[PDB]
């Protein structure tokens, strides 16, 4: 998955969180939350095909914009009454949409929020663990390079002393 | 300031994960803020420097030991208790066959839970980004040295071949 902070136009004051889980080409789940409510939509490959056909765009580029847009200067839109989500690719004060998706309001949003925070805390734990091994490996590699430099200097010294 | 976010389970709500966020401006011993949240509501309490010393005294515990226990329990066997009707949070130390209360706190139901939850998530997302940056730099520094190693080793081997031939 990827969790991105976004601002909606209808609510520029606060930060929303866009959680996308999936390659995206084979349909995905998109979740929006403001820390209280949550909206979730499962986008099928069928629904994807119908969006790229309604706007006459290449699959690869379309998914590429999805990939470039959903995982993170794009703008994001969501109406809490119609529950339709869409984003635009902006360029030169000119913009166009990449389809819309329906995000149904979730009955028990606290479950989603809890899961999102747990995911982040688990990720932090995993990254710290990885860093501990990488620190040691980095230090070992620097030490081994120093050893080789000293070993190589010894060889050159022996060659030059040999010459004379 | 600094903070620590911990996952806990409550005796009275064993199924749901709660999050305990403890933060301090200077140091834990000089005052901290303790927030409990289930991802929907949040309760917060401020603990002053003098309240810590008074709690240690009421417990007939040496202040350093009391603070040491707060660190082990609130920053992360300890049990956590909270009731959404009393807004009263206490945790206990459980040794073999016996437990005892390690101080308690009265939390106040926050008025803006969503704001607190968003700020907490943002903190985690910022930490993930910083940790990913750190990993990327560590791995590049390691890989850069390995490349220099392999380059230097080409010369080392040639010098060995030259020296072996000359000393042969």
Residue numbers in the entry:
A (entry chain B): 3 to 24, 27 to 76, 83 to 174
B (entry chain A): 1 to 76, 83 to 174
Original authors' sentences:
Motivated by the crosslinks observed between the Spc110pNCC and γTuSC, we sought a higher-resolution structure of the NCC region via X-ray crystallography. Previous work indicated that Spc1101-220 is only weakly dimeric. Using the proven strategy of fusing weakly interacting coiled-coils with stabilizing domains, we found that an N-terminal fusion of Spc110p164-207 with a domain from Xrcc4 produced high yields of soluble protein. The Xrcc4-Spc110p164-207 construct crystallized in a variety of conditions, diffracted to 2.1 Å, and enabled phases to be obtained by molecular replacement using Xrcc4 as a search model. As expected, the electron density map was consistent with a coiled-coil, with interpretable density for Spc110p164-203 residues. When the coiled-coil was docked into the 6.9 Å cryo-EM map using cross-correlation in Chimera, the X-ray model occupied most of the alpha-helical cryo-EM density. Importantly in the docked conformation the majority of the unique crosslinks were satisfied. Given the observed pitch of the coiled-coil in the crystal structure, as well as density for larger side chains, we were able to assign the register of the NCC. We observed a significant number of crosslinks between the N-terminal portions of Spc97p and Spc110pNCC. Thus, this region and not CM1 was responsible for the coiled-coil-γTuSC interaction apparent in the cryo-EM map.
